[PDB]
Design a protein around this ligand. Structure first.
Ligand SMILES: CCCCCCCCCCCCCC(=O)CSCCNC(=O)CCNC(=O)[C@H](O)C(C)(C)COP(=O)(O)OP(=O)(O)OC[C@H]1O[C@@H](n2cnc3c(N)ncnc32)[C@H](O)[C@@H]1OP(=O)(O)O
Ligand SMILES: CCOC(=O)c1cnc2ccc(OC)cc2c1SCCC#N
Ligand SMILES: [Cl-]
Ligand SMILES: [Mg+2]
Length: 385
C-alpha cells in the first residue's frame, strides 16, 4: 500500500530499521507556541464535539457509536462491545484531559458519527521515560468509511496533545501501518467450550467430540495460591512495588504512579478484576484481567461473548504457569466464556501447557514521533485496552 497519510507523519517508513544506539524523536525541539490553534477542517455538515465521558448521556452516545461501528474480527463473527462503565474507567485516568475525548457530529441529525481519544501516561521505551499520549477508540461510522475522516481525527488529536507539550504517543492496531515496534499474536483459552463451538468460534472433530472438548478444558475449582483475593485500597502501595519492580525488565512499559495503580487496578465489577496474595503484609503475587464483551453478530441464541483479557500478572511465590491457571479459574468464577492473552511479557511460556489456542490476528504496537529498534513481543511490558 502507498500510506499516503502516514508518510507525511513523523513515523518510520516501511523499510526503516534502527539499531539499539538510536532511541529518540523523529522531530525534537518542538515548541508549544508554534502549535496550530485552529481546529482542523471537517467536511461541510460535520462539527467537532468535546464529549464529557463523565456525563451519562454523552458517554452513552460514545457507547452506541462503538457498539454499532467498532472493531470486528477478520471473520465478521464478533464486534467488540466495550461497556459504557468500561469507557468511563478507560478514559478518566489520573490527569486525563476532557478535551482529548473528541467526537464528530453530523449536524443535520445531531448524532455522533466519529470518535478518537487519548489519555496521558509516562512510557519507558528502551530505558528512556517519556510523557506520551495513549490513543484508543478511533471509530468512524460504517456509513462514512474511506472518506479520509480518520486522518482528520488523527491530526486534530495530535494538535490537542501537542498543546500540552506532549510530542509522542503510543497506540495499537490489528492493521499493519508504518511501522510496528513489536507485534504480538492473540491466544484464547476456552472456558465455556460448548458456547464457543455453538457460536462458530471453536471447532470439533472425530477425535475431539463435544464431550472430549468439555473434558479437555475442564478446570479444578481450587486456587494454586489459596489466599488470592480481590484487591482493596490497602493493597495499592504493595501492588505499585510488585508490578513496578517487575515491569522494569521490559523494553516498553508504562511507569505507573501510586494514583495510577489505584485507578487501573482497584476492582470494578464487569470492568477490571485484580486479585492479590498478601503474605506478611507484603503483596507477593497479583492477577488482573479486564472485561471486553463482543456482540455475536446475527446469533439468535447468544447475543454476547463474555471475554476476559489478561492485563498484568506477576508471581514471586508460585510458577507463572500456576499463576495463570489461577487467572483462568478466577475468570471462570466470574462467568467469563473465554480468557484471552497476548504473547507479551511471560505469557507465551504458558500457552501450550494451559491449552490456549493461537488466534488469527496479531496486535501491532506503535509509537508516534519516536525512532528506535523493534523487538520481539516478550519484551513488551504494556497492555493497552
Ligand atoms: C504526539 C501525539 C500523536 C497523537 C496521534 C498518534 C497516532 C494515533 C493513530 C490512531 C490510533 C488508533 C488506535 C486505536 O483506536 C485502536 S485500533 C482500532 C481502530 N478502530 C477500528 O478499527 C474501528 C472500525 N474501523 C473504523 O472505524 C475505520 O475503519 C477507521 C476509523 C479505523 C479508519 O477509517 P476509514 O474510513 O477506514 O479510513 P479513512 O478515513 O479513509 O482513513 C484512511 C487512512 O487511515 C489509516 N488508518 C486506518 N486504520 C487505522 C488505525 N487503526 N490506526 C491508524 N490509522 C489507520 C489508513 O492506513 C489510511 O492512511 P494511509 O492512506 O496513510 O494508509
Ligand atoms: C473467542 C476469542 O476471542 C476473540 O477471538 C475475539 C473476540 N471478539 C473480537 C471482536 C473484534 C476483533 O477485532 C480484531 C477481534 C475479536 C477477537 S480476536 C482479537 C481480540 C482477542 N482476543
Ligand atoms: Cl494538514
Ligand atoms: Mg472516512
Amino acid at each position: 500500500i502507498d500510506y499516503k497519510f502516514w508518510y507525511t507523519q513523523p513515523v518510520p517508513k516501511i523499510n526503516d530499521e534502527f539499531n539499539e544506539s538510536v532511541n529518540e524523536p523523529f522531530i525534537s525541539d518542538n515548541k508549544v507556541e508554534d502549535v496550530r490553534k485552529d481546529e482542523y477542517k471537517l467536511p461541510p455538515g460535520y462539527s467537532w464535539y468535546v464529549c464529557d465521558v463523565k456525563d451519562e448521556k454523552d458517554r452513552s452516545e460514545i457507547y452506541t457509536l462503538l457498539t454499532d461501528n467498532y472493531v470486528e474480527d477478520d471473520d465478521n463473527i464478533f464486534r467488540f462491545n466495550y461497556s459504557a462503565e468500561f469507557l468511563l474507567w478507560a478514559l478518566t485516568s489520573p490527569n486525563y484531559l476532557k478535551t482529548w475525548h473528541i467526537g464528530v457530529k453530523y449536524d443535520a441529525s445531531n448524532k455522533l458519527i466519529g470518535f478518537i481519544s487519548a489519555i496521558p501516561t509516562d512510557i519507558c521505551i528502551h530505558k528512556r521515560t517519556i510523557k506520551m499520549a495513549e490513543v484508543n477508540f478511533l471509530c468512524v461510522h460504517k456509513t462514512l468509511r474511506s472518506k479520509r475522516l480518520a486522518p482528520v481525527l488523527i491530526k486534530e488529536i495530535t494538535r490537542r496533545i501537542n498543546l500540552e507539550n506532549i510530542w509522542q504517543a503510543i497506540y495499537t492496531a490489528g492493521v499493519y501501518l508504518p511501522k510496528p515496534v513489536s507485534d504480538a499474536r492473540y491466544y484464547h483459552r476456552s472456558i465455556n467450550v460448548k458456547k464457543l463451538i455453538e457460536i462458530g468460534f471453536s471447532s470439533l472433530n472425530s477425535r475431539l467430540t463435544m464431550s472430549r472438548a468439555i473434558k479437555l478444558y475442564r478446570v479444578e475449582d481450587t486456587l494454586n495460591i489459596k489466599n488470592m483475593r480481590l484487591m482493596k485500597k490497602k493493597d495499592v502501595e504493595g501492588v505499585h512495588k510488585l508490578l513496578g519492580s517487575y515491569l522494569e525488565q521490559f523494553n516498553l512499559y508504562a511507569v505507573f504512579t501510586k494514583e495510577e495503580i489505584a485507578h487501573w487496578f482497584l476492582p470494578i465489577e464487569n470492568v477490571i478484576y485484580t486479585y492479590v496474595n498478601e503474605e506478611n503484609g507484603k503483596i507477593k503475587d497479583m492477577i488482573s484481567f479486564y472485561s471486553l464483551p463482543s456482540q455475536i453478530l446475527g446469533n439468535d441464541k447468544y447475543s454476547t461473548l463474555n471475554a476476559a483479557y489478561s492485563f498484568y500478572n506477576v508471581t514471586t511465590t508460585a510458577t507463572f504457569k500456576q499463576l495463570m491457571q489461577d487467572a483462568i479459574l478466577l475468570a471462570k468464577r466470574n462467568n467469563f466464556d473465554v480468557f484471552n492473552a497476548l504473547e507479551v511479557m511471560q505469557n507465551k511460556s504458558v500457552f501450550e501447557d494451559l491449552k490456549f489456542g493461537e488466534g488469527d490476528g496479531s496486535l501491532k504496537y506503535y509509537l508516534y514521533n519516536w525512532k528506535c529498534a523493534s523487538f520481539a513481543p516478550a519484551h513488551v511490558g504494556i497492555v493497552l485496552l
